[PDB]
Amino acid sequence: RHPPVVLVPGDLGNQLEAKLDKPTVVHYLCSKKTESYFTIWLNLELLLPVIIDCWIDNIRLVYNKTSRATQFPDGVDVRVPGFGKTFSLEFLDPSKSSVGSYFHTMVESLVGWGYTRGEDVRGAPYDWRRAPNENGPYFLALREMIEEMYQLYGGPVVLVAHAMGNMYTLYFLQRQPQAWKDKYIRAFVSLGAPWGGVAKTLRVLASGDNNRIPVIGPLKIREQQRSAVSTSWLLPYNYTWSPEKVFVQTPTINYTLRDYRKFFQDIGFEDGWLMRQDTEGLVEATMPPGVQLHCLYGTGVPTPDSFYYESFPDRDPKICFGDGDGTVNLKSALQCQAWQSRQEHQVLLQELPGSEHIEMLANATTLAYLKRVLLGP
Numbered sequence: 173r174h175p176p177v178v179l180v181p182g183d184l185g186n187q188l189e190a191k192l193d194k195p196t197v198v199h200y201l202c203s204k205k206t207e208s209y210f211t212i213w214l215n216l217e218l219l220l221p222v223i224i225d226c227w228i229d230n231i232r233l234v235y236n237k238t239s240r241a242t243q244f245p246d247g248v249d250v251r252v253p254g255f256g257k258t259f260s261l262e263f264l265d266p267s268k269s270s271v272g273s274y275f276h277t278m279v280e281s282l283v284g285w286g287y288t289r290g291e292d293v294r295g296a297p298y299d300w301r302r303a304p305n306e307n308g309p310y311f312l313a314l315r316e317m318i319e320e321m322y323q324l325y326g327g328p329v330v331l332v333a334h335a336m337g338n339m340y341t342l343y344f345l346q347r348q349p350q351a352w353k354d355k356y357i358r359a360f361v362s363l364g365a366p367w368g369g370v371a372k373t374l375r376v377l378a379s380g381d382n383n384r385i386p387v388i389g390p391l392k393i394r395e396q397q398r399s400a401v402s403t404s405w406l407l408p409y410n411y412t413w414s415p416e417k418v419f420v421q422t423p424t425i426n427y428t429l430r431d432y433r434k435f436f437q438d439i440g441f442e443d444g445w446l447m448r449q450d451t452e453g454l455v456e457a458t459m460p461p462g463v464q465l466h467c468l469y470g471t472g473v474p475t476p477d478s479f480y481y482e483s484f485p486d487r488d489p490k491i492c493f494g495d496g497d498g499t500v501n502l503k504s505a506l507q508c509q510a511w512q513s514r515q516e517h518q519v520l521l522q523e524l525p526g527s528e529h530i531e532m533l534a535n536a537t538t539l540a541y542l543k544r545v546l547l548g549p
């Protein structure tokens with residue numbers, strides 16, 4: 173009898189749905205109203221050039237300087253479907269196209285080992301545009317789901333998290349009493365955790381990143397990417413990187429992680445600084461989760477490290493690459509080492525050489541490791 177499993181996805185890592193009754197639109201071809209919720213991520217037909225402005229106008233967040241919190245635009249609601257199920261993390265596109273295949277391979281493996289979707293394997297999707305401080309209801313639901321699974325399946329749960337989901341999970345665990353964790357959590361499997369931030373966030377905020385949707389212009393998509401609090405939350409931290417490391421070079425000025433205030437001024441996005449101040453303290457840099465932890469990190473994949481702009485910030489930069497999994501810098505991934513001596517439960521590090529950030533979820537070596545955690549040797 174295997175332990176129950178909860179899957180926690182990363183940024184862009186689950187479906188999102190929206191419903192509209194807007195006072196105004198950015199152009200005539202945008203819908204003001206929808207009769208039902210529709211899939212806003214991932215739905216390829218919404219990301220065509222004509223209609224991308226409509227999508228941006230609906231999926232952007234509004235930052236309120238007074239409340240220091242985000243809001244949806246007027247007349248837009250966004251929901252997270254499939255909480256407690258797996259469909260919305262298995263496939264990002266409900267057409268089930270391979271372009272959106274995310275947790276599917278892993279869930280198929282779990283089911284082959286005797287798990288049942290929605291029962292002893294459940295997903296914990298969330299609004300990944302936000303940081304954990306504005307996802308309180310999610311954490312309550314997660315705690316309840318874990319307790320339910322413990323009761324139903326007769327033992328403590330294994331959390332398996334990918335990318336930013338790891339930081340969501342750490343935030344959650346840092347806030348639960350040790351006695352609760354000792355009873356209800358069997359282990360935490362961390363895949364590709366950006367503990368110390370990722371360097372590519374600088375380029376995203378400055379000049380946009382359209383690599384996920386290449387037919388769209390980077391300056392257009394930048395509007396949405398800046399609006400997501402999670403982007404500013406994952407700027408490089410000084411517990412991983414040197415305060416003297418230059419992340420952005422231009423012909424006249426450098427930006428290090430001690431220069432974020434100037435950076436946000438200079439790219440014309442002052443709200444980003446406020447978001448960073450709101451979020452930089454959320455995850456305690458050094459406090460370990462207090463559960464058995466398996467830290468899996470990819471290496472040997474060129475990963476954005478720093479950027480040179482000939483023209484700043486409205487032209488794409490030249491990119492300098494360092495080590496990591498293609499998205500998460502190796503330095504960020506390695507914050508676990510420090511936790512080894514700071515908690516009693518074991519912290520196991522596992523290098524995955526040549527394993528790319530998303531591919532690691534469907535990789536046979538990753539799955540073999542998970543099998544050993546769940547089923548024994």
Ligand SMILES: *[C@@H]1O[C@H](CO)[C@@H](O)[C@H](O)[C@H]1NC(C)=O
Binds near residue numbers: 236237238239243
């Ligand atoms: C910002 O929040 C304050 C207090 O909650 C509220 O008075 C105001 O309506 C908000 N501003 C916007 C533009 O929604």
Ligand SMILES: *[C@@H]1O[C@H](CO)[C@@H](O)[C@H](O)[C@H]1NC(C)=O
Binds near residue numbers: 410415430
């Ligand atoms: C590390 O980061 C924070 C600022 O957000 C601060 O508490 C601490 O003093 C910093 N240390 C530096 C810049 O050396």
Ligand SMILES: *[C@@H]1O[C@H](CO)[C@@H](O)[C@H](O)[C@H]1NC(C)=O
Binds near residue numbers: 425
């Ligand atoms: C910016 O970076 C370069 C090193 O790349 C350094 O010489 C220069 O002094 C830095 N800017 C400031 C204000 O120190």
Ligand SMILES: *[C@@H]1O[C@H](CO)[C@@H](O)[C@H](O)[C@H]1NC(C)=O
Binds near residue numbers: 523524527536
């Ligand atoms: C899976 O990960 C291993 C290391 O863990 C890596 O060497 C291998 O190339 C990966 N598989 C694929 C298909 O890339």
